[PDB]
PDB file of C-alpha atoms and ligand atoms in Angstrom:
ATOM      1  CA  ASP W  24     -92.785  25.009 -18.097  1.00 19.88           C
ATOM      2  CA  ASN W  25     -89.960  22.565 -15.998  1.00 20.64           C
ATOM      3  CA  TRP W  26     -87.959  21.037 -18.546  1.00 16.68           C
ATOM      4  CA  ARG W  27     -84.764  18.691 -18.542  1.00 15.08           C
ATOM      5  CA  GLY W  28     -81.522  18.959 -20.422  1.00 16.01           C
ATOM      6  CA  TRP W  29     -78.522  16.521 -21.284  1.00 15.29           C
ATOM      7  CA  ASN W  30     -75.651  16.848 -21.043  1.00 14.83           C
ATOM      8  CA  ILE W  31     -72.476  13.991 -21.105  1.00 16.67           C
ATOM      9  CA  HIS W  32     -69.571  15.858 -19.123  1.00 17.59           C
ATOM     10  CA  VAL W  33     -68.858  15.999 -15.435  1.00 18.72           C
ATOM     11  CA  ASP W  34     -68.815  18.016 -12.585  1.00 17.20           C
ATOM     12  CA  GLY W  35     -65.878  21.460 -13.637  1.00 19.60           C
ATOM     13  CA  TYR W  36     -66.219  20.980 -17.123  1.00 19.36           C
ATOM     14  CA  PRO W  37     -66.724  23.909 -19.858  1.00 22.67           C
ATOM     15  CA  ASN W  38     -69.746  22.646 -21.059  1.00 21.59           C
ATOM     16  CA  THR W  39     -71.500  21.523 -17.643  1.00 26.82           C
ATOM     17  CA  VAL W  40     -70.811  25.066 -15.626  1.00 24.46           C
ATOM     18  CA  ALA W  41     -72.121  26.414 -18.966  1.00 25.58           C
ATOM     19  CA  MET W  42     -75.405  24.843 -18.975  1.00 24.71           C
ATOM     20  CA  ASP W  43     -75.790  25.617 -15.638  1.00 21.43           C
ATOM     21  CA  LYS W  44     -75.586  29.243 -16.803  1.00 20.23           C
ATOM     22  CA  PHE W  45     -78.050  28.321 -19.350  1.00 22.93           C
ATOM     23  CA  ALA W  46     -80.348  26.695 -17.009  1.00 23.76           C
ATOM     24  CA  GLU W  47     -79.693  30.186 -14.463  1.00 24.98           C
ATOM     25  CA  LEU W  48     -80.081  32.665 -17.261  1.00 23.82           C
ATOM     26  CA  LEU W  49     -83.474  31.074 -18.704  1.00 25.20           C
ATOM     27  CA  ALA W  50     -84.754  31.140 -14.943  1.00 25.17           C
ATOM     28  CA  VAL W  51     -83.587  34.871 -14.749  1.00 24.74           C
ATOM     29  CA  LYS W  52     -84.675  36.177 -18.087  1.00 29.94           C
ATOM     30  CA  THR W  53     -88.289  34.812 -18.270  1.00 24.98           C
ATOM     31  CA  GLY W  54     -88.446  35.717 -14.387  1.00 25.50           C
ATOM     32  CA  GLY W  55     -89.054  32.389 -13.661  1.00 28.60           C
ATOM     33  CA  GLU W  56     -91.923  31.342 -16.377  1.00 28.30           C
ATOM     34  CA  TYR W  57     -89.476  28.494 -17.737  1.00 27.53           C
ATOM     35  CA  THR W  58     -87.208  26.628 -15.456  1.00 26.82           C
ATOM     36  CA  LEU W  59     -84.680  24.181 -16.375  1.00 28.90           C
ATOM     37  CA  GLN W  60     -83.370  20.651 -14.578  1.00 28.77           C
ATOM     38  CA  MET W  61     -79.746  19.334 -15.940  1.00 25.99           C
ATOM     39  CA  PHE W  62     -78.849  16.010 -15.868  1.00 24.61           C
ATOM     40  CA  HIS W  63     -75.105  15.760 -16.217  1.00 23.47           C
ATOM     41  CA  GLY W  64     -72.328  12.799 -16.675  1.00 22.34           C
ATOM     42  CA  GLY W  65     -75.041  11.632 -19.556  1.00 21.61           C
ATOM     43  CA  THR W  66     -76.757   9.467 -16.614  1.00 20.84           C
ATOM     44  CA  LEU W  67     -80.084   9.776 -18.615  1.00 21.08           C
ATOM     45  CA  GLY W  68     -78.507   8.037 -22.021  1.00 24.16           C
ATOM     46  CA  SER W  69     -76.128   7.680 -24.201  1.00 26.83           C
ATOM     47  CA  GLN W  70     -75.905  10.670 -26.491  1.00 25.93           C
ATOM     48  CA  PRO W  71     -77.746   9.363 -29.930  1.00 25.66           C
ATOM     49  CA  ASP W  72     -80.754   8.280 -27.282  1.00 30.85           C
ATOM     50  CA  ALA W  73     -80.319  11.558 -25.973  1.00 28.12           C
ATOM     51  CA  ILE W  74     -80.357  13.568 -29.378  1.00 27.54           C
ATOM     52  CA  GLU W  75     -83.588  10.810 -30.430  1.00 25.54           C
ATOM     53  CA  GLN W  76     -85.445  11.827 -26.984  1.00 24.16           C
ATOM     54  CA  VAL W  77     -84.764  15.730 -27.911  1.00 22.25           C
ATOM     55  CA  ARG W  78     -86.330  15.203 -31.207  1.00 19.98           C
ATOM     56  CA  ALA W  79     -89.371  12.998 -29.906  1.00 20.99           C
ATOM     57  CA  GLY W  80     -89.920  15.544 -26.970  1.00 22.94           C
ATOM     58  CA  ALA W  81     -89.486  13.761 -24.449  1.00 22.74           C
ATOM     59  CA  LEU W  82     -86.162  15.689 -23.033  1.00 20.85           C
ATOM     60  CA  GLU W  83     -86.455  19.437 -23.916  1.00 24.83           C
ATOM     61  CA  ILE W  84     -82.744  20.459 -24.357  1.00 25.26           C
ATOM     62  CA  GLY W  85     -79.419  18.690 -24.974  1.00 25.93           C
ATOM     63  CA  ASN W  86     -76.215  20.026 -25.269  1.00 21.34           C
ATOM     64  CA  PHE W  87     -74.983  18.228 -28.581  1.00 23.74           C
ATOM     65  CA  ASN W  88     -71.865  17.456 -30.434  1.00 27.21           C
ATOM     66  CA  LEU W  89     -73.070  17.700 -33.944  1.00 26.26           C
ATOM     67  CA  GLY W  90     -71.409  14.280 -34.799  1.00 30.81           C
ATOM     68  CA  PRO W  91     -74.121  12.046 -33.570  1.00 28.20           C
ATOM     69  CA  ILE W  92     -76.228  14.749 -35.054  1.00 26.53           C
ATOM     70  CA  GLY W  93     -75.064  14.181 -38.335  1.00 28.32           C
ATOM     71  CA  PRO W  94     -76.465  11.043 -39.438  1.00 25.70           C
ATOM     72  CA  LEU W  95     -80.139  12.532 -38.593  1.00 27.61           C
ATOM     73  CA  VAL W  96     -79.049  15.881 -40.747  1.00 27.02           C
ATOM     74  CA  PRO W  97     -77.101  15.728 -43.893  1.00 24.91           C
ATOM     75  CA  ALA W  98     -76.277  19.681 -43.374  1.00 24.55           C
ATOM     76  CA  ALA W  99     -74.987  19.203 -40.252  1.00 17.91           C
ATOM     77  CA  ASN W 100     -73.344  16.022 -41.191  1.00 15.53           C
ATOM     78  CA  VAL W 101     -70.647  18.779 -42.883  1.00 15.70           C
ATOM     79  CA  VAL W 102     -68.910  19.496 -40.163  1.00 16.16           C
ATOM     80  CA  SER W 103     -68.053  15.933 -39.571  1.00 17.37           C
ATOM     81  CA  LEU W 104     -66.019  15.965 -42.459  1.00 17.97           C
ATOM     82  CA  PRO W 105     -61.945  15.016 -41.676  1.00 15.44           C
ATOM     83  CA  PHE W 106     -59.906  18.551 -42.103  1.00 12.99           C
ATOM     84  CA  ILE W 107     -62.639  20.583 -43.258  1.00 14.09           C
ATOM     85  CA  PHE W 108     -61.918  23.166 -41.109  1.00 17.50           C
ATOM     86  CA  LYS W 109     -58.223  24.981 -40.501  1.00 16.35           C
ATOM     87  CA  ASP W 110     -58.799  25.707 -37.223  1.00 17.72           C
ATOM     88  CA  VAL W 111     -61.196  26.431 -34.307  1.00 20.80           C
ATOM     89  CA  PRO W 112     -61.576  30.466 -35.226  1.00 22.64           C
ATOM     90  CA  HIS W 113     -62.001  29.345 -39.010  1.00 22.35           C
ATOM     91  CA  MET W 114     -65.369  27.079 -37.538  1.00 23.88           C
ATOM     92  CA  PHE W 115     -66.608  29.886 -35.818  1.00 26.31           C
ATOM     93  CA  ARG W 116     -66.599  32.254 -38.695  1.00 25.72           C
ATOM     94  CA  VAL W 117     -67.816  29.464 -40.878  1.00 23.03           C
ATOM     95  CA  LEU W 118     -70.838  29.033 -38.230  1.00 23.63           C
ATOM     96  CA  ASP W 119     -71.764  32.726 -38.367  1.00 24.23           C
ATOM     97  CA  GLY W 120     -72.449  32.805 -41.817  1.00 25.13           C
ATOM     98  CA  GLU W 121     -74.538  30.989 -44.378  1.00 25.21           C
ATOM     99  CA  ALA W 122     -73.002  27.765 -43.625  1.00 23.83           C
ATOM    100  CA  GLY W 123     -74.453  27.904 -40.161  1.00 21.13           C
ATOM    101  CA  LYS W 124     -77.900  29.168 -40.934  1.00 21.23           C
ATOM    102  CA  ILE W 125     -78.166  26.107 -43.442  1.00 22.31           C
ATOM    103  CA  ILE W 126     -76.918  23.778 -40.685  1.00 20.01           C
ATOM    104  CA  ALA W 127     -79.682  25.483 -38.373  1.00 21.64           C
ATOM    105  CA  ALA W 128     -82.467  24.911 -40.840  1.00 20.19           C
ATOM    106  CA  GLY W 129     -81.318  21.421 -41.479  1.00 18.19           C
ATOM    107  CA  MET W 130     -81.545  20.480 -38.247  1.00 15.40           C
ATOM    108  CA  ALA W 131     -84.712  22.800 -37.426  1.00 12.58           C
ATOM    109  CA  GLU W 132     -86.091  20.535 -40.660  1.00 13.64           C
ATOM    110  CA  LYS W 133     -85.693  17.089 -38.246  1.00 17.87           C
ATOM    111  CA  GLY W 134     -87.614  18.767 -35.150  1.00 19.13           C
ATOM    112  CA  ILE W 135     -84.309  20.224 -33.290  1.00 19.18           C
ATOM    113  CA  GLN W 136     -83.126  24.008 -33.259  1.00 19.54           C
ATOM    114  CA  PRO W 137     -79.791  24.859 -32.314  1.00 21.13           C
ATOM    115  CA  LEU W 138     -79.928  28.026 -29.922  1.00 23.31           C
ATOM    116  CA  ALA W 139     -76.140  28.931 -29.559  1.00 25.75           C
ATOM    117  CA  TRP W 140     -73.005  26.945 -30.720  1.00 22.99           C
ATOM    118  CA  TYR W 141     -70.483  25.727 -28.001  1.00 18.57           C
ATOM    119  CA  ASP W 142     -66.509  24.791 -28.656  1.00 17.33           C
ATOM    120  CA  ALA W 143     -64.947  21.448 -28.390  1.00 12.18           C
ATOM    121  CA  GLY W 144     -61.441  22.288 -29.809  1.00 12.55           C
ATOM    122  CA  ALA W 145     -60.017  20.071 -32.578  1.00 16.30           C
ATOM    123  CA  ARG W 146     -60.214  16.366 -31.777  1.00 15.10           C
ATOM    124  CA  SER W 147     -56.643  14.225 -32.278  1.00 16.15           C
ATOM    125  CA  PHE W 148     -55.961  10.466 -32.061  1.00 15.74           C
ATOM    126  CA  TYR W 149     -54.686   8.672 -28.817  1.00 15.54           C
ATOM    127  CA  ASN W 150     -53.881   4.892 -27.774  1.00 13.04           C
ATOM    128  CA  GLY W 151     -51.540   3.286 -25.528  1.00 12.96           C
ATOM    129  CA  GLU W 152     -48.821   1.583 -27.793  1.00 13.92           C
ATOM    130  CA  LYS W 153     -46.945   4.519 -30.023  1.00 14.17           C
ATOM    131  CA  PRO W 154     -47.185   7.912 -31.414  1.00 13.22           C
ATOM    132  CA  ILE W 155     -48.835   8.294 -34.615  1.00 13.24           C
ATOM    133  CA  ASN W 156     -47.177  10.483 -36.765  1.00 13.80           C
ATOM    134  CA  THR W 157     -48.131   9.093 -40.331  1.00  8.28           C
ATOM    135  CA  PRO W 158     -51.391   7.194 -41.946  1.00  9.17           C
ATOM    136  CA  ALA W 159     -49.194   3.489 -41.407  1.00 11.48           C
ATOM    137  CA  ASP W 160     -49.242   4.007 -38.153  1.00 10.34           C
ATOM    138  CA  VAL W 161     -52.724   3.753 -37.641  1.00 11.23           C
ATOM    139  CA  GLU W 162     -53.177   0.151 -39.956  1.00 11.71           C
ATOM    140  CA  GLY W 163     -54.205  -2.317 -37.838  1.00 11.93           C
ATOM    141  CA  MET W 164     -55.362  -0.195 -34.792  1.00 12.33           C
ATOM    142  CA  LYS W 165     -58.610  -0.344 -33.486  1.00 15.44           C
ATOM    143  CA  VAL W 166     -59.545   3.290 -33.066  1.00 14.71           C
ATOM    144  CA  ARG W 167     -62.609   3.856 -31.248  1.00 11.29           C
ATOM    145  CA  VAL W 168     -64.951   6.511 -32.734  1.00  9.33           C
ATOM    146  CA  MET W 169     -68.594   8.097 -32.519  1.00  6.84           C
ATOM    147  CA  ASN W 170     -71.728   7.030 -34.133  1.00  5.02           C
ATOM    148  CA  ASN W 171     -71.207   8.349 -37.819  1.00  5.50           C
ATOM    149  CA  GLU W 172     -70.201   6.201 -40.509  1.00  7.46           C
ATOM    150  CA  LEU W 173     -67.955   8.938 -41.713  1.00  9.24           C
ATOM    151  CA  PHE W 174     -65.604   8.540 -38.789  1.00 11.82           C
ATOM    152  CA  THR W 175     -65.385   4.748 -39.528  1.00 13.48           C
ATOM    153  CA  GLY W 176     -64.365   5.713 -42.818  1.00 10.69           C
ATOM    154  CA  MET W 177     -61.959   8.286 -42.053  1.00  9.38           C
ATOM    155  CA  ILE W 178     -60.339   5.486 -39.841  1.00  6.82           C
ATOM    156  CA  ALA W 179     -60.749   2.435 -42.638  1.00  3.15           C
ATOM    157  CA  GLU W 180     -58.832   4.944 -45.176  1.00  4.73           C
ATOM    158  CA  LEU W 181     -55.924   5.566 -42.562  1.00  4.07           C
ATOM    159  CA  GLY W 182     -56.041   1.433 -42.176  1.00  4.02           C
ATOM    160  CA  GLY W 183     -57.261   0.593 -39.285  1.00  4.87           C
ATOM    161  CA  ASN W 184     -60.310  -0.460 -37.752  1.00  3.90           C
ATOM    162  CA  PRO W 185     -63.082   1.484 -36.378  1.00  2.58           C
ATOM    163  CA  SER W 186     -65.030   0.880 -33.585  1.00  2.00           C
ATOM    164  CA  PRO W 187     -68.302   2.803 -32.623  1.00  2.30           C
ATOM    165  CA  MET W 188     -69.090   3.046 -29.389  1.00  2.33           C
ATOM    166  CA  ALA W 189     -70.834   4.985 -26.721  1.00  2.00           C
ATOM    167  CA  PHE W 190     -68.160   7.483 -24.822  1.00  2.00           C
ATOM    168  CA  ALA W 191     -69.053   6.094 -21.724  1.00  2.00           C
ATOM    169  CA  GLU W 192     -67.644   2.829 -22.414  1.00  2.00           C
ATOM    170  CA  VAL W 193     -64.462   4.022 -23.852  1.00  2.00           C
ATOM    171  CA  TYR W 194     -62.608   3.870 -20.435  1.00  2.00           C
ATOM    172  CA  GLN W 195     -63.291   0.050 -20.282  1.00  2.00           C
ATOM    173  CA  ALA W 196     -62.356  -0.453 -23.851  1.00  2.00           C
ATOM    174  CA  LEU W 197     -58.634   0.988 -23.789  1.00  2.00           C
ATOM    175  CA  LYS W 198     -58.437  -0.531 -19.795  1.00  2.00           C
ATOM    176  CA  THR W 199     -59.026  -3.933 -21.277  1.00  2.00           C
ATOM    177  CA  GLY W 200     -57.651  -3.862 -24.882  1.00  2.00           C
ATOM    178  CA  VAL W 201     -61.019  -4.125 -26.505  1.00  2.00           C
ATOM    179  CA  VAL W 202     -59.657  -1.012 -28.406  1.00  2.00           C
ATOM    180  CA  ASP W 203     -56.189   0.153 -28.882  1.00  2.00           C
ATOM    181  CA  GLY W 204     -56.997   3.845 -28.993  1.00  2.00           C
ATOM    182  CA  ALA W 205     -59.508   6.672 -29.997  1.00  2.00           C
ATOM    183  CA  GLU W 206     -59.717  10.370 -30.696  1.00  2.00           C
ATOM    184  CA  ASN W 207     -60.953  13.487 -28.604  1.00  2.00           C
ATOM    185  CA  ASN W 208     -60.209  16.952 -27.082  1.00  2.00           C
ATOM    186  CA  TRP W 209     -57.657  17.938 -24.497  1.00  2.00           C
ATOM    187  CA  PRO W 210     -60.569  18.064 -22.164  1.00  2.00           C
ATOM    188  CA  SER W 211     -62.332  14.928 -22.989  1.00  2.00           C
ATOM    189  CA  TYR W 212     -58.899  12.964 -23.026  1.00  2.00           C
ATOM    190  CA  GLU W 213     -58.246  14.194 -19.384  1.00  2.00           C
ATOM    191  CA  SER W 214     -61.725  14.124 -17.803  1.00  2.00           C
ATOM    192  CA  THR W 215     -62.893  10.911 -18.449  1.00  2.00           C
ATOM    193  CA  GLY W 216     -59.552   9.174 -17.310  1.00  2.00           C
ATOM    194  CA  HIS W 217     -58.895   7.730 -21.095  1.00  2.00           C
ATOM    195  CA  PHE W 218     -55.171   9.480 -20.585  1.00  2.00           C
ATOM    196  CA  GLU W 219     -54.278   6.966 -17.739  1.00  2.00           C
ATOM    197  CA  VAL W 220     -55.116   4.017 -20.185  1.00  2.00           C
ATOM    198  CA  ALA W 221     -53.730   5.288 -23.247  1.00  2.00           C
ATOM    199  CA  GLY W 222     -51.001   7.882 -22.720  1.00  2.00           C
ATOM    200  CA  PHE W 223     -49.435   9.102 -26.135  1.00  2.00           C
ATOM    201  CA  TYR W 224     -51.422  11.667 -27.591  1.00  2.00           C
ATOM    202  CA  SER W 225     -50.916  12.755 -31.357  1.00  2.00           C
ATOM    203  CA  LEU W 226     -51.467  15.840 -32.724  1.00  2.00           C
ATOM    204  CA  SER W 227     -53.951  15.367 -35.794  1.00  2.00           C
ATOM    205  CA  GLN W 228     -56.500  17.674 -35.051  1.00  2.00           C
ATOM    206  CA  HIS W 229     -58.252  15.655 -37.841  1.00  2.00           C
ATOM    207  CA  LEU W 230     -61.794  16.861 -36.635  1.00  2.00           C
ATOM    208  CA  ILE W 231     -63.012  20.191 -35.641  1.00  2.00           C
ATOM    209  CA  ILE W 232     -66.806  19.707 -34.411  1.00  2.00           C
ATOM    210  CA  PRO W 233     -68.792  22.248 -32.927  1.00  2.00           C
ATOM    211  CA  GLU W 234     -71.594  21.408 -30.237  1.00  2.00           C
ATOM    212  CA  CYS W 235     -74.916  23.518 -29.384  1.00  2.00           C
ATOM    213  CA  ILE W 236     -77.537  24.108 -27.068  1.00  2.00           C
ATOM    214  CA  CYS W 237     -80.490  22.329 -28.844  1.00  2.00           C
ATOM    215  CA  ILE W 238     -83.755  22.097 -28.275  1.00  2.00           C
ATOM    216  CA  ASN W 239     -86.855  20.201 -29.418  1.00  2.00           C
ATOM    217  CA  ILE W 240     -89.045  22.717 -32.291  1.00  2.00           C
ATOM    218  CA  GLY W 241     -92.121  22.253 -30.830  1.00  4.15           C
ATOM    219  CA  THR W 242     -91.196  23.344 -27.733  1.00  2.00           C
ATOM    220  CA  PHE W 243     -89.676  26.350 -28.761  1.00  2.00           C
ATOM    221  CA  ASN W 244     -92.363  27.407 -31.371  1.00  3.08           C
ATOM    222  CA  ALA W 245     -94.694  27.197 -28.441  1.00  2.38           C
ATOM    223  CA  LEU W 246     -92.961  30.060 -26.892  1.00  2.32           C
ATOM    224  CA  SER W 247     -94.422  33.276 -27.287  1.00  2.00           C
ATOM    225  CA  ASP W 248     -92.158  35.916 -29.337  1.00  2.00           C
ATOM    226  CA  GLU W 249     -90.753  37.703 -26.092  1.00  2.00           C
ATOM    227  CA  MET W 250     -89.889  34.285 -24.772  1.00  2.00           C
ATOM    228  CA  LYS W 251     -88.254  33.031 -27.859  1.00  2.00           C
ATOM    229  CA  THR W 252     -85.944  36.364 -27.258  1.00  2.00           C
ATOM    230  CA  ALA W 253     -85.332  35.090 -24.087  1.00  2.00           C
ATOM    231  CA  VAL W 254     -84.182  31.754 -24.484  1.00  2.00           C
ATOM    232  CA  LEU W 255     -81.969  32.900 -27.355  1.00  2.00           C
ATOM    233  CA  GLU W 256     -80.232  35.149 -25.161  1.00  2.00           C
ATOM    234  CA  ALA W 257     -79.942  33.049 -22.429  1.00  2.00           C
ATOM    235  CA  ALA W 258     -78.138  30.202 -25.097  1.00  2.00           C
ATOM    236  CA  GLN W 259     -75.949  32.971 -27.081  1.00  5.49           C
ATOM    237  CA  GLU W 260     -74.693  34.439 -23.019  1.00  3.34           C
ATOM    238  CA  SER W 261     -73.997  31.067 -21.836  1.00  5.03           C
ATOM    239  CA  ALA W 262     -72.432  29.804 -25.226  1.00  4.57           C
ATOM    240  CA  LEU W 263     -69.933  33.325 -24.889  1.00  5.03           C
ATOM    241  CA  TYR W 264     -69.217  32.292 -21.148  1.00  4.47           C
ATOM    242  CA  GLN W 265     -68.338  28.565 -22.285  1.00  6.41           C
ATOM    243  CA  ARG W 266     -66.372  29.463 -24.956  1.00  5.42           C
ATOM    244  CA  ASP W 267     -64.296  31.366 -22.543  1.00  7.39           C
ATOM    245  CA  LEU W 268     -64.119  28.503 -19.906  1.00  9.42           C
ATOM    246  CA  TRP W 269     -63.421  26.536 -22.691  1.00  4.99           C
ATOM    247  CA  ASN W 270     -59.634  27.523 -23.679  1.00  2.59           C
ATOM    248  CA  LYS W 271     -58.677  28.022 -20.447  1.00  2.00           C
ATOM    249  CA  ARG W 272     -59.685  24.435 -20.096  1.00  2.35           C
ATOM    250  CA  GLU W 273     -57.923  23.311 -22.806  1.00  6.69           C
ATOM    251  CA  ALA W 274     -54.731  24.185 -21.834  1.00  7.18           C
ATOM    252  CA  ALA W 275     -55.184  23.403 -18.106  1.00  5.77           C
ATOM    253  CA  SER W 276     -56.237  19.787 -19.206  1.00  7.37           C
ATOM    254  CA  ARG W 277     -53.031  19.486 -22.002  1.00  8.85           C
ATOM    255  CA  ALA W 278     -50.982  20.520 -18.768  1.00  8.00           C
ATOM    256  CA  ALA W 279     -52.263  18.433 -16.128  1.00  8.49           C
ATOM    257  CA  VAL W 280     -51.827  15.244 -18.533  1.00  7.54           C
ATOM    258  CA  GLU W 281     -48.683  16.289 -19.470  1.00  4.12           C
ATOM    259  CA  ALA W 282     -47.483  16.303 -15.988  1.00  4.89           C
ATOM    260  CA  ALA W 283     -48.659  12.992 -15.453  1.00  5.21           C
ATOM    261  CA  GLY W 284     -46.681  11.325 -18.156  1.00  5.21           C
ATOM    262  CA  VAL W 285     -48.330  11.994 -21.095  1.00  4.27           C
ATOM    263  CA  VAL W 286     -46.288  11.605 -24.239  1.00  4.14           C
ATOM    264  CA  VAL W 287     -47.393  14.419 -26.739  1.00  4.60           C
ATOM    265  CA  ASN W 288     -46.311  14.697 -30.294  1.00  2.63           C
ATOM    266  CA  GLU W 289     -46.852  16.605 -33.235  1.00  2.00           C
ATOM    267  CA  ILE W 290     -47.788  15.593 -36.767  1.00  4.17           C
ATOM    268  CA  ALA W 291     -45.564  17.755 -38.868  1.00  6.23           C
ATOM    269  CA  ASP W 292     -47.077  16.321 -42.302  1.00  6.37           C
ATOM    270  CA  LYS W 293     -50.714  16.194 -42.030  1.00  4.66           C
ATOM    271  CA  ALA W 294     -50.956  16.248 -45.882  1.00  4.54           C
ATOM    272  CA  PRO W 295     -51.324  12.233 -46.193  1.00  2.98           C
ATOM    273  CA  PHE W 296     -53.870  11.726 -43.663  1.00  2.00           C
ATOM    274  CA  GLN W 297     -55.629  14.843 -45.335  1.00  2.09           C
ATOM    275  CA  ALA W 298     -55.066  12.868 -48.756  1.00  2.00           C
ATOM    276  CA  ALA W 299     -56.116  10.109 -47.500  1.00  2.00           C
ATOM    277  CA  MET W 300     -59.584  11.347 -46.961  1.00  2.00           C
ATOM    278  CA  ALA W 301     -60.451  11.659 -50.470  1.00  2.00           C
ATOM    279  CA  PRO W 302     -63.025   8.713 -50.441  1.00  2.00           C
ATOM    280  CA  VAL W 303     -65.052   9.767 -47.531  1.00  2.00           C
ATOM    281  CA  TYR W 304     -65.569  13.380 -49.155  1.00  2.00           C
ATOM    282  CA  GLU W 305     -66.364  12.359 -52.552  1.00  2.00           C
ATOM    283  CA  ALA W 306     -68.884   9.473 -50.735  1.00  2.00           C
ATOM    284  CA  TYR W 307     -70.504  12.357 -48.726  1.00  2.00           C
ATOM    285  CA  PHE W 308     -71.075  14.151 -52.600  1.00  2.00           C
ATOM    286  CA  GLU W 309     -72.169  10.947 -53.598  1.00  2.00           C
ATOM    287  CA  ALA W 310     -74.480  10.704 -50.828  1.00  2.58           C
ATOM    288  CA  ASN W 311     -75.630  14.405 -50.398  1.00  2.28           C
ATOM    289  CA  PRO W 312     -75.173  15.963 -54.054  1.00  2.00           C
ATOM    290  CA  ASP W 313     -77.226  19.061 -52.903  1.00  2.00           C
ATOM    291  CA  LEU W 314     -75.233  19.757 -50.236  1.00  2.00           C
ATOM    292  CA  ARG W 315     -71.542  20.052 -52.190  1.00  2.00           C
ATOM    293  CA  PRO W 316     -71.459  23.499 -52.138  1.00  2.00           C
ATOM    294  CA  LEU W 317     -72.526  23.835 -48.503  1.00  2.00           C
ATOM    295  CA  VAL W 318     -68.373  22.231 -48.206  1.00  2.00           C
ATOM    296  CA  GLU W 319     -67.268  24.828 -51.062  1.00  2.00           C
ATOM    297  CA  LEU W 320     -68.944  27.476 -49.235  1.00  2.00           C
ATOM    298  CA  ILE W 321     -66.714  26.477 -46.202  1.00  2.00           C
ATOM    299  CA  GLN W 322     -63.375  25.983 -47.878  1.00  2.00           C
ATOM    300  CA  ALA W 323     -64.021  28.621 -49.238  1.00  2.00           C
ATOM    301  CA  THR W 324     -63.900  30.757 -46.187  1.00  2.00           C
ATOM    302  CA  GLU W 325     -61.497  32.845 -44.808  1.00  2.00           C
TER     303      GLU W 325
HETATM  304  O1  BDP A 401     -66.442  11.020 -28.275  1.00  2.00           O
HETATM  305  C1  BDP A 401     -67.312  11.462 -27.941  1.00  2.00           C
HETATM  306  O2  BDP A 401     -68.730  10.675 -28.026  1.00  2.00           O
HETATM  307  C2  BDP A 401     -67.639  12.495 -27.169  1.00  2.00           C
HETATM  308  O3  BDP A 401     -66.649  13.890 -27.627  1.00  2.00           O
HETATM  309  C3  BDP A 401     -66.322  14.929 -27.140  1.00  2.00           C
HETATM  310  O4  BDP A 401     -65.760  15.510 -27.572  1.00  2.00           O
HETATM  311  C4  BDP A 401     -67.711  15.486 -27.265  1.00  2.00           C
HETATM  312  O5  BDP A 401     -67.976  17.087 -26.332  1.00  2.00           O
HETATM  313  C5  BDP A 401     -69.008  14.695 -26.196  1.00  2.00           C
HETATM  314  O6  BDP A 401     -70.420  15.093 -26.777  1.00  2.00           O
HETATM  315  C6  BDP A 401     -68.742  13.322 -27.546  1.00  2.00           C
HETATM  316  O7  BDP A 401     -69.981  12.230 -26.557  1.00  2.00           O
HETATM  317 CL1   CL A 402     -72.571   8.189 -26.663  1.00  2.00          CL
END
């Protein structure tokens, strides 16, 4: 009845405050029959490890980015395709439609039930050496990515050298030059300290990946109908709050790092970055023929 949950983020981060709210709302709506203890800051382990713990039932709850879920769940892997959404509002429109049900089904199929969707904005490149404006600027650059071969591909097609690595280890790696750069949204770039050791941020906005509040499906299925309704309502309400927190944080984060001296650039012509992803998309299609229509469905959505 007393659950444990994972979140990788630090204090005050939108996801952190929102998962606390999820835990609070779970206890309220279930009259104390179900409670949740959060372990924030990744103190329970890396994201892939936590995903395995939730799937195995060693942990009940996670706030997981879908990036590291992709290698486990083909349908979820669709949101890890570079340049598949035009922007965050587009993503949410796609997720509240048929794409979302398919992604959820695929997830539930691998033992992990999404309960609500969180915003994590768009991810963009950052490094300590120079601005990125064209794919040529990425050639030879060692860029850290999350643990998903779609992202190793993305970097290789821009001529970089990908380095999949745990999020926790990125600050040191940038500090010592083991990697040259990485990529993420404004709040992560700011909260982890990466901006202090990688002060060029280039708005490629190459990935727009949602997150979820995740529950082990056995845990969820064992609930009564009314408790499932309570858990879903808590999750959904936490996520609406998270989305409000998120939009204020993106601006505050961006402003704080610009003030600290970060040099920001837009990418005027993103088209060559997109064009270079042909082989990554085509290589997902070859691995997952059945899911070509999921990709087309998303790209067809306004
Ligand atoms: O880059 C990463 O590993 C991290 O990126 C952040 O944006 C996600 O919120 C976090 O779940 C990931 O662990
Ligand atoms: Cl990680």
